[PDB]
Design a binder for these strands. Structure first.
Ligand SMILES: [Mg+2]
Ligand SMILES: [Mg+2]
Ligand SMILES: [Mg+2]
Ligand SMILES: [Mg+2]
Ligand SMILES: [Mg+2]
Ligand SMILES: [Mg+2]
Ligand SMILES: [Mg+2]
Ligand SMILES: [Mg+2]
Ligand SMILES: [Mg+2]
Ligand SMILES: [Mg+2]
Ligand SMILES: [Mg+2]
Ligand SMILES: [Mg+2]
Ligand SMILES: [Mg+2]
Ligand SMILES: [Mg+2]
Ligand SMILES: [Mg+2]
Ligand SMILES: [Mg+2]
Ligand SMILES: [Mg+2]
Ligand SMILES: [Mg+2]
Ligand SMILES: [Mg+2]
Ligand SMILES: [Mg+2]
Ligand SMILES: [Mg+2]
Ligand SMILES: [Mg+2]
Ligand SMILES: [Mg+2]
Ligand SMILES: [Mg+2]
Ligand SMILES: [Mg+2]
Ligand SMILES: [Mg+2]
Ligand SMILES: [Mg+2]
Ligand SMILES: [Mg+2]
Ligand SMILES: [Mg+2]
Ligand SMILES: [Mg+2]
Ligand SMILES: [Mg+2]
Ligand SMILES: [Mg+2]
Ligand SMILES: [Mg+2]
Ligand SMILES: [Mg+2]
Ligand SMILES: [Mg+2]
Ligand SMILES: [Mg+2]
Ligand SMILES: [Mg+2]
Ligand SMILES: [Mg+2]
Ligand SMILES: [Mg+2]
Ligand SMILES: [Mg+2]
Ligand SMILES: [Mg+2]
Ligand SMILES: [Mg+2]
Ligand SMILES: [Mg+2]
Ligand SMILES: [Mg+2]
Ligand SMILES: [Mg+2]
Ligand SMILES: [Mg+2]
Ligand SMILES: [Mg+2]
Ligand SMILES: [Mg+2]
Ligand SMILES: [Mg+2]
Ligand SMILES: [Mg+2]
Ligand SMILES: [Mg+2]
Ligand SMILES: [Mg+2]
Ligand SMILES: [Mg+2]
Ligand SMILES: [Mg+2]
Ligand SMILES: [Mg+2]
Ligand SMILES: [Mg+2]
Ligand SMILES: [Mg+2]
Ligand SMILES: [Mg+2]
Ligand SMILES: [Mg+2]
Ligand SMILES: [Mg+2]
Ligand SMILES: [Mg+2]
Ligand SMILES: [Mg+2]
Ligand SMILES: [Mg+2]
Ligand SMILES: [Mg+2]
Ligand SMILES: [Mg+2]
Ligand SMILES: [Mg+2]
Ligand SMILES: [Mg+2]
Ligand SMILES: [Mg+2]
Ligand SMILES: [Mg+2]
Ligand SMILES: [Mg+2]
Ligand SMILES: [Mg+2]
Ligand SMILES: [Mg+2]
Ligand SMILES: [Mg+2]
Ligand SMILES: [Mg+2]
Ligand SMILES: [Mg+2]
Ligand SMILES: [Mg+2]
Ligand SMILES: [Mg+2]
Lengths: 190, 137, 76, 57
RNA sequence: ACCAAACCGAUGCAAACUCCGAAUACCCAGAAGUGCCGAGCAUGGGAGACACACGGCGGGUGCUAACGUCCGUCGUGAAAAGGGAAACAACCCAGACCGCCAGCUAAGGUCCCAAAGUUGUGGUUAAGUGGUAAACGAUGUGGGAAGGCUUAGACAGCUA
RNA sequence: CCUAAAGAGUAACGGAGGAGUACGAAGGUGCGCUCAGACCGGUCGGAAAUCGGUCGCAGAGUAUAAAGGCAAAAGCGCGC
RNA sequence: CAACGGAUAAAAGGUACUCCGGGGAUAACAGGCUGAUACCGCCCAAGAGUUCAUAUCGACGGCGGUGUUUGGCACCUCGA
RNA sequence: GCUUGACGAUCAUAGAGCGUUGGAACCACCUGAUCCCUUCCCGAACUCAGAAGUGAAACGACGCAUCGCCGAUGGUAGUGUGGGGUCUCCCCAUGUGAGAGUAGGUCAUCGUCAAGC
């Protein structure tokens, strides 16, 4: 499911990386983390783009296969072409059994249609944010954090502190004394 | 239309429009966006023309953001006037657009309604556009 | 137009760069204010001109608190 | 040790710095060849005017 | 139930904003070789010139109009013939001491005008496109990666 | 000050502002000292006078535009 | 002596009654370059058309063409 | 080597914030204002004479990354030279190469002298 094939890269620079994206259809990348040195790799553009169509691509563990040796990584950042939108660079973070790591996890909004503020007062659900940044152990990284809006009335604001999280998951932003709005119910536009 | 409340200086040099938009190129507020794929210039009456057409089509719910602000003043020289004699007076305000910049955003509607609401807006703008969706990274 | 005025240029800046050999009395920097401060063997004029008071070599070091830029004369 | 340098392009309309790099090697006329020592400061004049010369090694 | 300083977070912009910050270009010193046998500097005899032009790059002005105009920095013309761009100061190649019914090349070219491949291999175009052009429109055609249905009978047509 | 292309210099009936003074102390030196603002408490003032405290550190000041500077303060007060 | 390297201590106008030396180094006419403007096409479609966007029109906006108006420039012609 | 004072080198990886701890000596608070000296008033600060009390305040030492400050590898932007295009902008060859962000670091490191072990 979550598997990627990579090859070691040895010709670095601006001119070499531009030739990869014209002549060979590859994508430069780098693997760092754990207690090891970073490592430049190359991987096919078609393979990385196919894996990224999945929803939980950034909040799941990916088995990278560099050469023949496999290793456990996680997509940490991603560079895109500002106009065309395709991926130009990717960096992975090595995953270690006992080491807290930071990831971006998407939110899932459920039972929007049965909300109190929607059916009674005719309000509209507005998603202020769509993902939160968490820090936890690798063994309990969630693919998506759940938020429900059934018991929400007109004018009510949902905050980070309100939503519950899986055991062993920390919200980072809430830890730094800054809770941010997630969603609300507001009066109709017209 | 849209223009600054006040500015430090009345006039400005023409300058140049180069580079891609590495900033302002992500869907940050809504779910779908209209994005520039060619470079150019939007004159603050095209922005107003395109905002009415987009908003008049949805007509039921939905939040809309405008991510462009025309803050560059441009001058014009009156007709039957020779070269020289000082710079001309400010006539309208305009915005610089680089490829990849998001112009409008919307949420609270379906993908099919947003896609045809953005087509009406793009017919008023003098530059190529595309339809994009919000992503995690 | 009601704008066509300007003043003459003053030819300010560094006159001797790091490593150059200097003599006493040589002007090192022309300034408004003190972008550079006088180090060892360097004097300050009433218009903030740095000049040499000994023979040697220009140094151009950053040191101390406040993050000041100093000009000093050292042995050649 | 040494290296064969040949001039294969005209010197008209080149930058004055590139003219001095060809002249600093001893090259004068198209198809003229010299024998220069392989010193680090002889290579710098060859690299600066690479597009005017042919280096037979 | 309207407005709201301020604060917190997200998100843009600046010739006369800057927490940052190149390449290059400029000073300085030490070295090898080359220099037409000199290059640098000083002092004297004689000047001319102080209407510049276009092309590239960085800018102001203009409408990022003009073979417009005003700067910076290169190249050419001026004061430079020869070959190429049909013709074509300023574009590309190249700097003409004289003679030869000798040879090799540059830019550009090789069916006839008109010197040299109707050369070889693999594709594309049917528009004389090539041999002038924008938003936008269209079952033109070549290639690639993927998807939705389908002998539990898919799509079109038809019988209800 | 910008144009001015990170040494100097650099044009336009290009974009913006000032000067044609002041001071016998507003100069010299020795000694000493730090601002604007916010909040709390306090008679008539009450958002803003003077007083006490905490925070603040330069968001003040500099005779006069703007730029560059200012803790050995170049800012402030006193004796000679 | 600010016309700020300051012609003299001391100085305004008219010429369609005019005159000489020159200049396409510089304007008016026509030509050229450009195309803001002008004119002519097209794109989008809120709307008008009893209903119905395109029979006929078409707001807010966008893209071209022609040299055709008003202009910009000053390349040719002031020994016509 | 251990502790405290004076003067430096270096100017945040050295700072801020929180917690604990130090009086044998030193230092600090402390008593008084006779005497030198002082306040545009006040022994508050400056100064003089010591010494009964205390480590409260201040200062020092030791902990913690919460804030601050440092910070790669890789990629991207820009760019000198030579050459191309559909030429208001880009591409290729070659040399160079940020800023931001990411992984992660940091509760400093030294020198001279004098008092006690
Ligand atoms: Mg790179
Ligand atoms: Mg390159
Ligand atoms: Mg301009
Ligand atoms: Mg100046
Ligand atoms: Mg003095
Ligand atoms: Mg040439
Ligand atoms: Mg040339
Ligand atoms: Mg700047
Ligand atoms: Mg430079
Ligand atoms: Mg000779
Ligand atoms: Mg002479
Ligand atoms: Mg002249
Ligand atoms: Mg002449
Ligand atoms: Mg000139
Ligand atoms: Mg001229
Ligand atoms: Mg010229
Ligand atoms: Mg130009
Ligand atoms: Mg120009
Ligand atoms: Mg031009
Ligand atoms: Mg010209
Ligand atoms: Mg030029
Ligand atoms: Mg020339
Ligand atoms: Mg030529
Ligand atoms: Mg020539
Ligand atoms: Mg001449
Ligand atoms: Mg010629
Ligand atoms: Mg010549
Ligand atoms: Mg010829
Ligand atoms: Mg010719
Ligand atoms: Mg031709
Ligand atoms: Mg010919
Ligand atoms: Mg050619
Ligand atoms: Mg031959
Ligand atoms: Mg050839
Ligand atoms: Mg041929
Ligand atoms: Mg023939
Ligand atoms: Mg033949
Ligand atoms: Mg054949
Ligand atoms: Mg044809
Ligand atoms: Mg044709
Ligand atoms: Mg300069
Ligand atoms: Mg410069
Ligand atoms: Mg200058
Ligand atoms: Mg000049
Ligand atoms: Mg003063
Ligand atoms: Mg100032
Ligand atoms: Mg005094
Ligand atoms: Mg005068
Ligand atoms: Mg004068
Ligand atoms: Mg003068
Ligand atoms: Mg003068
Ligand atoms: Mg006279
Ligand atoms: Mg008269
Ligand atoms: Mg006459
Ligand atoms: Mg005459
Ligand atoms: Mg003329
Ligand atoms: Mg003239
Ligand atoms: Mg006329
Ligand atoms: Mg006529
Ligand atoms: Mg005419
Ligand atoms: Mg004409
Ligand atoms: Mg004419
Ligand atoms: Mg109707
Ligand atoms: Mg009809
Ligand atoms: Mg005509
Ligand atoms: Mg005309
Ligand atoms: Mg003319
Ligand atoms: Mg002229
Ligand atoms: Mg001219
Ligand atoms: Mg004529
Ligand atoms: Mg005439
Ligand atoms: Mg005649
Ligand atoms: Mg890097
Ligand atoms: Mg180049
Ligand atoms: Mg780099
Ligand atoms: Mg960095
Ligand atoms: Mg930083």
């Amino acid at each position: 499911d979550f598997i990627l094939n990579a090859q070691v890269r040895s010709d670095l620079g601006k001119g070499a990386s531009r030739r990869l994206r014209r002549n060979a259809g590859l994508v430069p990348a780098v693997v760092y983390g754990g207690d090891k040195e970073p490592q430049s790799v190359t991987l096919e553009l078609r393979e990385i783009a196919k894996l990224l169509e999945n929803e939980a691509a950034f909040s799941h563990v990916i088995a990278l296969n560099v050469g023949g040796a496999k290793e456990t990584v996680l997509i940490k950042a991603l560079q895109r072409h500002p106009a065309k939108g395709f991926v130009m660079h990717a960096d992975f973070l090595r995953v270690v059994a006992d080491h807290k790591l930071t990831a971006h996890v998407p939110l899932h909004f459920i039972n929007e249609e049965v909300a109190v503020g929607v059916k009674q007062a005719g309000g509209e659900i507005s998603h202020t944010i769509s993902e939160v940044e968490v820090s936890c152990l690798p063994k309990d990284l969630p693919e998506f954090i759940e938020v429900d809006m059934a018991k929400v009335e007109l004018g009510q604001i949902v905050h980070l502190s309100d939503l519950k999280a899986p055991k062993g998951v920390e919200l980072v932003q809430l830890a730094h004394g800054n809770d941010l709005a997630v969603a609300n119910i507001h009066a109709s536009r017209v | 239309m849209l223009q600054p409340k006040r500015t430090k200086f009345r006039k400005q040099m023409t300058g140049h429009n180069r580079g891609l938009a590495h900033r302002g190129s992500k869907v940050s507020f809504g779910e779908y966006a209209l994005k520039a794929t060619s470079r150019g210039r939007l004159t603050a009456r095209q922005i107003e023309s395109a905002r009415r057409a987009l908003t008049r089509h949805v007509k039921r719910g939905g939040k809309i953001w405008i991510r462009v602000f025309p803050d560059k003043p441009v001058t014009k020289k009156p007709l039957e006037v020779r070269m020289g004699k000082g710079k001309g007076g400010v006539e309208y305000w305009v915005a610089q657009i680089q490829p990849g910049k998001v112009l409008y955003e919307i949420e609270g509607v379906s993908e099919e309604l947003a896609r045809e609401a953005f087509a009406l807006a793009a017919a008023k703008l003098p530059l190529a556009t595309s339809f994009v969706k919000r992503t995690v990274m | 137009t009601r704008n066509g005025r300007d003043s003459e240029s003053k030819r300010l800046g560094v006159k001797l760069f790091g490593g150059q050999a200097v003599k006493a009395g040589n002007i090192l920097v022309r300034q408004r204010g003190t972008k550079f401060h006088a180090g060892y063997g360097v004097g300050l004029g009433k218009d903030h001109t740095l000049f040499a008071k000994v023979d040697g070599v220009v140094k151009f070091e950053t040191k101390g608190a406040f993050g000041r830029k100093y000009v000093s004369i050292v042995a050649a | 040790a040494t290296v064969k340098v040949t001039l294969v392009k005209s010197l008209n309309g080149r930058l004055a710095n590139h003219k001095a790099c060809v002249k600093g090697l001893g090259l004068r006329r198209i198809n003229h060849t010299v024998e220069v020592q392989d010193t680090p400061e002889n290579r710098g004049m060859i690299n600066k005017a690479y597009y005017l010369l042919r280096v037979e090694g």
